[PDB]
Design a protein around this ligand. Structure first.
Ligand SMILES: CCCCCCCCCCCCCCCCCC(=O)OC[C@H](COP(=O)([O-])OCC(O)COP(=O)([O-])OC[C@@H](COC(=O)CCCCCCCCCCCCCCCCC)OC(=O)CCCCCCCCCCCCCCCCC)OC(=O)CCCCCCCCCCCCCCCCC
Ligand SMILES: CCCCCCCCCCCCCCCCCC(=O)OC[C@H](COP(=O)([O-])OCC(O)COP(=O)([O-])OC[C@@H](COC(=O)CCCCCCCCCCCCCCCCC)OC(=O)CCCCCCCCCCCCCCCCC)OC(=O)CCCCCCCCCCCCCCCCC
Ligand SMILES: CCCCCCCCCCCCCCCCCC(=O)OC[C@H](COP(=O)([O-])OCC(O)COP(=O)([O-])OC[C@@H](COC(=O)CCCCCCCCCCCCCCCCC)OC(=O)CCCCCCCCCCCCCCCCC)OC(=O)CCCCCCCCCCCCCCCCC
Ligand SMILES: COC1=C(OC)C(=O)C(C/C=C(\C)CC/C=C(\C)CC/C=C(\C)CC/C=C(\C)CC/C=C(\C)CC/C=C(\C)CC/C=C(\C)CC/C=C(\C)CC/C=C(\C)CCC=C(C)C)=C(C)C1=O
Ligand SMILES: CCCCC/C=C/C/C=C/C/C=C\C/C=C\CCCC(=O)O[C@H](COC(=O)CCCCCCCCCCCCCCCCC)COP(=O)(O)O[C@@H]1[C@H](O)[C@H](O)[C@@H](O)[C@H](O)[C@H]1O
Lengths: 66, 68, 96, 57, 23, 481, 99, 98, 318, 149, 85, 69
């Protein structure tokens, strides 16, 4: 996903900060960030599920319209 | 809710009464009688203020009878 | 506490006794016949720590039938952390 | 041989002083109070002594 | 959050008790 | 179970401490410097914990034995603890240069950071005045030690000494608050203290003991987080101490003490009676941040005052007890922490300088221009420039302050943030478009800072493009309280 | 006294509430033994690569392996316990329905 | 000592007998106290336990009155400390009430 | 009060312990000790005393009278007040404290003050560093005595010394924990200075190691203090480990079993052991000594708390 | 009369904050602790009195004395006879809790004492052991034998 | 009488914070006052535990004892390091 | 076993001691109530004489901190 492009940047941005050129095999380990982005989106879904659960718990609470 | 010599403390009973209330009462009030009970155990503020009013009125009467 | 009053007066009566032992020689016999040793701060801090841990030993010592096998293991965890500290001090070499 | 007794004698008259340390502060306390000292004298016993001196009126 | 009584009633009988061990 | 994040990071610290001490005192290995070897295993004992902690998400609440006695974990403690270990991960990572380049054979600085992280893991989940104080002091004691570590330069020694004095006095105030509250309530557990302090209404109901107790607890905390009226040394504390220990005691105690404040001040005592001092602290903290940042030169002290001001911008989320306010406060801690880890990663990248001010910080637009881009990104983020993440933090905080009716708090926040925006725009201009000013050259930063600076720079710029995960996290944490 | 009763508990069907040690560890799935094995590897490696600089490659590898054993084992234990207890996916109910 | 004045010594001396006998009165008093600790609400059960126990003492001081005097002499001498004289404890128990 | 009946006999005990040490340590060396003064040197302590009292001062110096003229008083008062809780027989303790043992620990922690102050008021760098070294030694073998007492405390119920000596009716803690008695004795040897462990007390470095203004009273009071501290720390190896006032319980027909006499016999054994072990062993140099209190008697004391706690927890012997 | 003699502690606490001579400061420090232990005795907390003595005026003010000497600055009661049948000494009723029920607040002070050990080591080792006693670290093959200065 | 044993501790704590404020110049008095105020809160916990008849006070007082002691250890060690050689 | 013997003896004599203390304290309480109603004169003072409960439970009246120590 977009995590692949982001990782190549994070690695290339890292290379740009240490002064090293933009070259090596860690740009192929940015696939790990693609895994990370998929997990982060998966965690967004799981998280909004849990937040909806806590929100219906709150709606049950707070006097429940009384 | 312990005690300095074991033995359920002094008013772990009052705290259990104030916790069972706050457990199954939907409001902080209507469970406040038990809260004032428990704080009365803790600091004896009501008992001490009553004793001090007793002694204060006694002392005022005695001074009014002595000096006149 | 009730039994603390005998030693409370003991301090003062021993003060009196030592004052008499002081005044006895004074009356008789008239006219005619290193920048810093920091190891003393390491030894001192280390005694402080080990006496703190003995302070924690005392209630666990006197109440060990109450805490059956769980207070014992909790104290042994506290003591394994003491031992890790003491081994870090032994290896680092503060005991010299 | 009983030659060590001469060197035992100072330990004796230092043992005859701890016997006095122990029995003096016993028979002095056994005098001020008609009864020996109670070692395990927990608060139950001070409470019972209070109520006891209050029972004999 | 009223998670106190569920332990109090649970362990009140062992120690820290005024009059149960008496009788 | 339920202490597997603590059981591990305590066993791992011992395994590292024994492993480090045996080798550094070894003739066979020529007395090697065990830093960066007990490190590396240090920060992995963090990641394995962060893996032990994140995985067992339902398991953290696995017992009752801990509940009404020692400490209560929940979703808030769980998420805030995954953050502390993550923010401790960044802080150990940025130090790897400080261990090799700077001559430190003292590995136990690592094991002390690990013990402090355990103390903070027990602060987050602290759910009793006694546990709160004990964990607070565990982490504060590790930090006094590792802030007085450098014994050659006398500048770090007196800084660590006044840090110890300030922290011990803050803990004394906090502890007197705990005493007054306990003495006037007969209950220390937050689950017990909550039941008592419902309908306490100090300003309406005469309860002076509990009032002075909550006031002293708030004062001790506002000392620990170095808010404005009680910072009192914090600039000199951050300036004198070494840079990585500053990065540690400047971002992680904030996270931990703020989670602890959310525990005691939103559950243990909930009223509009105590948050008045935090409202005043927010006002004067944003004021002091803005002005002193306008006044400072030394980049370390500039970051000190910037952190004080941003801590101010945090407390406006606590200055109103609404869920939106608490969620704004949590958003503000994550965007203040990631940005501070970034700023300190940058300051650690520039090891070559001595204690030097923004003028010597110059020329970075020329030497290492990508690092200057990153530094401008981070400083903008602090300022709150719209297209960045710090803007999202300050903006949601101000929106919570408006929804909470604290219009004046939002006003002082916006004027102080605009002052800061002006100051940091002027700083970036002076660094980029002019002022060459003596061209000090830097050894390159290592991969560890590089990825943290790079990932965090990506997080700051590409944040508004996906704020759903963090907002969901912080709203869940606020609901859990 | 103690009790394993949990907050947010039993979200999945419990197999054995409060599993005894030597059973929750005898429940290690070939994924747990694969989590306890990858953690010990990533901990031995960071324990060897870390120690090549100070010359301690062997003993730093050993201490990284000790850290990895402790951590990966407590992780495999977390997993197999939240599986035996009702906390995790827990597809190992066939082990109870069969035995 | 003397008439059955329920002193400390004479009470802790007969506590074995106050255990065998007068157990119903004691357990009733304790049941009240554990029900509600207000002193009035079982002043009657207090009279009841005190009645049977004063009776038990006046009993022990009739048969074996010399034995029940040496043992209380102990318990007053050593303050209610049992082990300090098991000889008096046995001689008192053996002669009449076991 | 009756504090006289515990300080005066203890003063006589210390005065006669100087003679008991000289005489026993002489008998060891194949020679009669003080033997002309009294019938058997029995008046030799009174002669030493009455001499030290009649010795003119070297310089009056009564001006500095609050600094170090009450510091020996403090050391001696502490060495004498730690005798209250020590029980000589059933109900012969002067003040049965239910935390008696911890009170002894505190009295030692104040004897540290005694030494440090009485050494600092001596404006002699060598003597002050010697006093500081002696205090660090006395306080480094106090963590080991602390843990040894935690062992003998685990065996007992409470810290009440009368209970610790009453908890040995079945067997003295010297028989099962003999290795501990050897560590308490070798620590009480080292806590006090009089020991194989007395480099700060190396014959010369001791006199020039406590004060500059002697006047005799200071010399006698330090030695009276060291010998009372010794009678005390030998009256602890006999409460805790040996049966405080307990016989072997064989109940002989010849022996009417007095209590204080048994306590006396045992404290005499430990005093004779103090002397014997001063005669027969070389000094430890204070650089191996401090490396024996940390590296030898702390690990072997910690192990013992875990051993006597374990073996008493598994089998419910507590 | 000893009840109100806490005024001694009160004035000695005012001395330590209003004294330029450090010996008087540490002396009145020790005095404050002695009177605070007297107070803790009057309350019957016997264990805490002895612990104040030990871990304050046998360790901590020992530290402070070291820092001064060296490094000079220049009727109606109703006693309920239940719960008295078994009187719990203060140590027993601290151990019934600290090691079994609130034991994590006791293993955390364990970690604080361990951090104090590590701290006193890393701070005041003072380059007197392997911290710098490793070697001067001078090698031959890395030297130029001063032929060319 | 609880007020007598608390307000006296309260003003001992006030003495500690007062010495903190005044003595920002001298640090040994700073640490003196630190341990002073960590006593006036410790003695405070003990007094409030005797008054309330609650044991949490004494548990917390013991832990504050063995935490303020480690704090004094590290404090004085930092102070000795501050006076470098 | 000796301590359990001692505690059994104490628990057995506990009801008699507690009955004596109940009678004594209730007599002192009657006299304290007859003193209150006399120092208050019952028109101006506490219109309810005892009214000490403050909820549905009884407690020994009041004291200092720790007398038995
Ligand atoms: C530093 C921290 C190190 C880890 C500390 C936490 C470990 C807790 C493990 C535990 O309690 O397991 C009991 C449990 C007992 O069995 P079970 O699982 O209940 O049921 C199945 C059994 O077949 C049969 O089980 P069972 O029916 O026998 O039930 C257990 C039983 C009887 O249990 C036992 O007898 C076994 C106890 C195992 C050892 C636990 C204590 C030792 C670790 C800490 C002390 C220092 C290290 C000492 C190492 C000694 C060797 C193990 O229960 C009891 O009533 C007695 C034990 C009570 C619970 C444990 C009390 C001590 C732990 C609490 C204090 C420390 C917590 C960590 C810190 C948290 C805050 C930061 O499992 C074990 O016995 C083995 C556990 C695995 C090892 C534990 C950690 C050892 C670390 C050694 C090196 C440390 C450095
Ligand atoms: C479109 C085409 C796609 C093709 C397919 C692509 C397939 C995958 C591609 C490759 C994926 C990643 C491969 C492994 C990681 C490489 C790391 C790296 O760059 O090392 C730099 C590193 C820089 O320093 P150095 O030269 O090692 O010298 C050390 C310094 O002295 C240091 O200073 P000192 O002297 O003070 O020493 C302190 C020490 C301190 O050292 C430490 O403390 C190290 C601790 C680091 C953290 C843990 C690392 C090991 C475990 C990683 C995680 C494993 C689980 C999965 C991933 C988790 C998330 C990362 O520093 C070190 O440098 C130690 C060693 C550094 C390397 C550590 C990592 C390697 C060992 C473990 C391998 C793990 C593989 C991960 C696979 C990822 C994907 C699943 O240099 C090397 O390691 C060079 C040789 C190794 C690489 C061989 C060539 C690549 C082989 C695979 C290529 C396949 C793709 C072909 C693509 C073709 C088109 C382009
Ligand atoms: C949780 C808390 C855990 C707390 C315990 C400490 C954990 C960490 C222990 C050390 C970890 C590794 C670094 C130290 C070196 C080492 O162990 O072996 C290097 C060494 C390197 O060899 P290599 O280069 O791979 O190949 C052989 C070659 O000949 C080339 O090598 P080499 O044969 O020439 O030998 C090189 C030399 C490299 O080192 C030196 O030469 C430096 C100077 C060494 C001085 C002598 C060692 C003194 C250590 C013991 C101190 C006294 C006892 C302390 C007791 C504490 C209280 C119980 O090796 C050694 O020194 C021998 C091992 C020394 C281990 C020291 C640490 C363990 C003792 C402390 C235990 C603490 C309490 C534990 C309580 C129970 C629960 C955990 O290992 C071997 O030779 C292979 C055998 C290893 C056997 C497996 C076990 C090793 C670890 C022992 C502790 C087991 C429990 C660990 C915790 C478990 C938690 C679940
Ligand atoms: C380490 O090595 C060392 C040695 O090595 C072998 C030593 O010898 C010694 C031992 C030598 C010493 C002198 C140590 C100090 C001991 C004493 C001086 C003995 C103390 C004696 C007393 C307590 C008695 C004090 C006073 C007395 C006896 C007289 C008081 C009354 C009168 C004058 C009236 C007397 C009249 C009549 C008729 C009798 C009654 C030391 C210290 C030493 O350090
Ligand atoms: C809450 C948040 C907190 C913020 C902080 C979190 C970070 C936490 C922990 C991690 C922190 C820092 C990263 C540390 C990285 C790490 O050790 O290994 C990586 C391996 O991989 C890549 O180099 C390969 C390239 C890796 C690319 C990863 C891309 C990730 C992108 C994520 C999305 C962007 C951000 C979105 C938000 C780096 O080299 P390494 O250490 O293996 O091995 C060597 C390295 O080669 C060096 O140059 C040196 O030789 C030596 O020091 C050693 O580091």
């Amino acid at each position: 996903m977009v995590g692949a492009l982001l990782g190549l940047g994070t690695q290339m941005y890292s290379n740009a900060l240490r002064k090293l050129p933009y070259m090596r095999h860690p740009w192929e380990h940015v696939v790990g960030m693609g895994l990370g982005a998929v997990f982060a989106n998966q965690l967004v879904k799981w998280d909004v599920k849990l937040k909806e659960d806590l929100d219906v718990m709150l709606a049950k609470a707070r006097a429940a319209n009384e | 809710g312990w005690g300095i010599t074991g033995n359920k403390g002094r008013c772990y009973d009052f705290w259990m009464d104030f916790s069972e209330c706050m457990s199954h009462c939907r409001e902080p009030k209507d469970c406040t009688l038990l809260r004032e009970d428990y704080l009365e155990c803790l600091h004896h503020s009501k008992e001490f203020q009553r004793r001090n009013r007793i002694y204060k009125e006694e002392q005022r009467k005695l001074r009014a009878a002595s000096r006149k | 506490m009730l039994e603390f009053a005998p030693i409370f007066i003991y301090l003062v009566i021993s003060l009196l006794v030592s004052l008499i032992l002081l005044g006895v020689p004074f009356l008789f016999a008239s006219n005619s016949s290193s920048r810093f040793d920091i190891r003393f701060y390491l030894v001192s801090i280390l005694f402080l720590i080990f006496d703190l841990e003995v302070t924690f030993f005392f209630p666990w010592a006197v109440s060990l039938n109450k805490i059956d096998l769980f207070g014992f293991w909790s104290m042994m965890a506290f003591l394994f952390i003491l031992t890790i500290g003491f081994l870090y001090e032994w290896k680092r070499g503060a005991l010299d | 041989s009983l030659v060590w007794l001469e060197a035992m004698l100072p330990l004796g008259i230092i043992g005859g002083m701890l016997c006095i340390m122990g029995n003096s502060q016993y028979y002095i306390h056994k005098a001020y109070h008609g009864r020996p000292k109670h070692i395990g004298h927990d608060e139950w016993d001070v409470a019972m002594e209070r109520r006891d001196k209050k029972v004999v009126e | 959050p009223y998670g106190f009584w569920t332990f109090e009633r649970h362990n009140a009988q062992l120690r820290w008790d005024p009059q149960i061990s008496q009788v | 179970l339920a202490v597997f994040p603590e059981i591990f990071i305590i066993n791992a610290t011992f395994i590292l401490l024994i492993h480090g001490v045996v080798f550094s005192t070894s003739k066979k290995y020529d007395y090697p410097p065990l830093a960066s070897n007990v490190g590396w295993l240090g920060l992995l004992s963090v990641l394995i914990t962060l893996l032990l902690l994140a995985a067992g998400a339902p398991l953290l609440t696995i017992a009752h034995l801990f509940w009404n006695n020692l400490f209560r974990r929940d979703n808030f403690t769980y998420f805030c603890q995954i953050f502390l270990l993550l923010s401790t991960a960044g802080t150990i990572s940025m130090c790897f240069d400080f261990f090799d380049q700077e001559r430190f054979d003292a590995f136990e600085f690592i094991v002390l950071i690990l013990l402090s992280t355990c103390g903070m893991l027990f602060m987050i989940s602290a759910y009793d005045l006694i546990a709160m104080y004990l964990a607070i002091e565990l982490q504060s004691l590790c930090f006094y030690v590792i802030a007085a570590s450098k014994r050659k330069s006398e500048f770090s020694t007196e800084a660590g000494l006044k840090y110890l004095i300030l922290g011990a006095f803050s803990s004394g105030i906090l502890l007197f608050g705990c005493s007054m509250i306990y003495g006037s309530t007969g209950a220390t557990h937050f689950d017990q203290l909550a039941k008592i302090l419902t309908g306490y209404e100090i300003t309406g109901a005469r309860s002076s003991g509990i009032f002075m107790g909550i006031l002293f607890i708030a004062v001790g905390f506002l000392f620990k987080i170095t808010a404005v009226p009680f910072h009192m040394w914090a600039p000199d504390i951050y300036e004198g101490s070494p840079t990585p220990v500053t990065a540690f005691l400047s971002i992680a105690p904030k996270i931990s003490i703020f989670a602890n404040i959310l525990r005691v001040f939103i559950y243990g005592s909930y009223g509009a009676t105590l948050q008045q001092i935090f409202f005043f602290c927010s006002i004067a903290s944003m004021i002091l941040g803005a002005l002193a940042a306008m006044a400072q030169t030394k980049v370390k002290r500039l970051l000190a005052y910037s952190s004080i001001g941003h801590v101010g911008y945090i407390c406006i989320g606590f200055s109103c007890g609404t869920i939106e306010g608490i969620q704004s406060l949590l958003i503000g801690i994550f965007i203040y922490a990631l940005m501070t880890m970034d700023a300190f990663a940058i300051v650690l990248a520039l090891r070559q300088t001595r204690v030097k001010y923004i003028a010597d910080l110059g020329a970075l637009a020329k030497t290492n221009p990508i690092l200057a881009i990153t530094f401008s990104i981070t400083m903008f983020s602090y300022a709150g420039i719209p297209p960045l993440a710090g803007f999202c933090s300050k903006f949601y905080l101000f929106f919570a302050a408006l929804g909470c009716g604290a219009y004046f708090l939002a006003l002082v926040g916006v004027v102080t943030s605009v002052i800061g925006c002006f100051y940091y725009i002027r700083l970036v201009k002076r660094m980029f478009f002019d002022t060459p000013r003596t061209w000090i050259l830097y050894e390159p930063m290592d991969r560890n800072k590089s990825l943290l600076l790079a990932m965090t720079s990506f997080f700051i710029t590409l944040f508004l493009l996906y704020p759903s995960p963090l907002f969901s996290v912080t709203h869940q944490m606020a609901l859990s309280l | 006294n103690t009790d394993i009763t949990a907050l947010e508990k039993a979200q999945y069907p419990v197999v054995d509430r409060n599993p005894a040690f030597t059973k929750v560890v005898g429940n290690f799935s070939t994924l747990d033994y694969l989590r306890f094995s990858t953690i010990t590897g990533i901990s031995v490696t960071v324990g060897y690569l870390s120690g090549i600089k100070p010359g301690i490659k062997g003993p730093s590898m050993v201490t990284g392996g000790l850290i990895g054993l402790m951590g990966g084992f407590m992780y495999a234990y977390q997993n197999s316990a939240g599986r035996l207890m009702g906390f995790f996916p827990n597809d190992g109910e066939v082990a109870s329905y069969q035995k | 000592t003397g008439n059955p004045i329920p002193t400390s010594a004479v009470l802790t001396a007969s506590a074995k007998h106050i255990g065998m006998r007068c157990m119903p009165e004691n357990v009733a008093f304790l049941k009240c106290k554990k029900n509600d600790p207000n002193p009035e609400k079982c002043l009657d059960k207090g009279r009841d336990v005190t009645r049977c126990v004063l009776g038990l003492l006046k009993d022990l001081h009739q048969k074996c009155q010399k034995e029940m005097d040496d043992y209380v002499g102990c318990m007053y001498y050593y303050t209610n400390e049992f082990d300090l004289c098991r000889k008096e404890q046995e001689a008192f128990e053996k002669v009449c009430p076991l | 009060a009756e504090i006289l009946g515990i300080i005066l006999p203890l003063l006589l005990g210390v005065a006669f312990l100087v003679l008991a040490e000289r005489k026993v340590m002489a008998f060891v060396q194949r020679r009669k000790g003080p033997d002309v003064v009294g019938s058997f040197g029995l008046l030799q302590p009174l002669a030493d005393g009455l001499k030290l009292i009649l010795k003119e001062p070297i310089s009056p110096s009564s001006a500095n009278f609050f600094l170090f003229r009450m510091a020996p008083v403090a050391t001696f008062m502490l060495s004498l007040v730690a005798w209250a809780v020590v029980p000589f027989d059933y109900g012969m303790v002067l003040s049965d404290l239910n935390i008696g043992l911890l009170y002894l620990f505190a009295i030692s922690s104040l004897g540290v003050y005694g030494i440090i102050i009485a050494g600092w008021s001596s404006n002699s760098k060598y003597a002050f560093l010697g006093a500081l070294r002696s205090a660090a030694q006395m306080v480094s073998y106090e963590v080991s005595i602390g843990l040894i007492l935690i062992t003998v405390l685990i065996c007992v119920g409470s810290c009440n010394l009368s209970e610790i000596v009453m908890a040995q009716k079945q067997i003295w803690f010297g028989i099962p924990l003999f290795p501990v008695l050897v560590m308490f004795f070798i620590s009480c040897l080292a806590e006090t200075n009089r020991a194989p462990f007395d480099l700060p007390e190396a014959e010369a470095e001791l006199v020039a190691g406590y004060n500059v203004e002697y006047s005799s009273m200071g010399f006698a009071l330090f030695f009276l203090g060291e010998y009372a501290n010794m009678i005390l720390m030998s009256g602890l190896c006999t409460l805790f480990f040996l049966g405080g006032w307990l016989p072997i319980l064989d109940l002989p027909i010849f022996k009417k079993i007095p209590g204080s006499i048994w306590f006396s016999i045992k404290v005499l054994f430990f005093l004779f052991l103090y002397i014997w072990v001063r005669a027969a062993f070389p000094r430890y140099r204070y650089d191996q000594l401090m490396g024996l209190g940390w590296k030898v008697f702390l690990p072997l004391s910690l192990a013992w708390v875990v051993s006597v706690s374990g073996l008493l927890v598994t089998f419910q012997w507590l | 009369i000893l009840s109100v003699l806490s005024s001694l502690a009160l004035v000695s606490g005012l001395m330590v904050v209003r004294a330029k001579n450090p010996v008087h400061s540490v002396l009145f420090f020790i005095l404050v602790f002695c009177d605070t232990s007297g107070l803790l005795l009057l309350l019957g907390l016997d264990f805490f009195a002895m612990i104040f003595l030990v871990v304050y005026i046998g360790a901590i003010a020992v530290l402070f004395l070291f820092v001064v000497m060296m490094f000079h600055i220049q009727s109606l009661r109703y006693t309920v006879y239940a719960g008295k049948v078994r009187s719990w000494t203060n140590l027993e009723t601290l151990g019934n809790l600290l090691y079994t029920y609130y034991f994590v607040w006791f293993l955390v002070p364990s970690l604080i004492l361990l951090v104090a050990m590590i701290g006193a080591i890393v701070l005041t080792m003072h380059r007197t052991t392997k911290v710098k006693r490793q070697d001067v670290f001078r090698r031959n093959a890395i030297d130029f034998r001063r032929t060319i200065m | 009488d609880l007020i007598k044993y608390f307000t006296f501790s309260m003003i001992i704590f006030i003495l500690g914070i007062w010495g903190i404020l005044l003595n920002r110049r001298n640090i040994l008095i700073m640490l003196m006052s630190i341990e002073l105020m960590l006593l006036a809160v410790n003695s405070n916990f003990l007094v409030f535990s005797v008054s309330l008849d609650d044991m949490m006070g004494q548990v917390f007082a013991l832990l504050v004892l063995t935490v303020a002691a480690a704090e004094s250890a590290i404090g004085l060690a930092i102070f000795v390091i501050t006076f470098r050689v | 076993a000796l301590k359990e013997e001692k505690y059994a003896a104490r628990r057995t004599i506990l009801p008699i001691l507690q009955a004596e203390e109940d009678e004594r304290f209730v007599s002192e309480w009657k006299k304290y109530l007859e003193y209150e109603a006399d120092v208050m004169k019952d028109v101006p003072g506490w219109k309810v004489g005892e009214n000490v409960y403050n909820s549905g439970r009884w407690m020994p009246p009041a004291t200092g901190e720790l007398r038995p120590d």
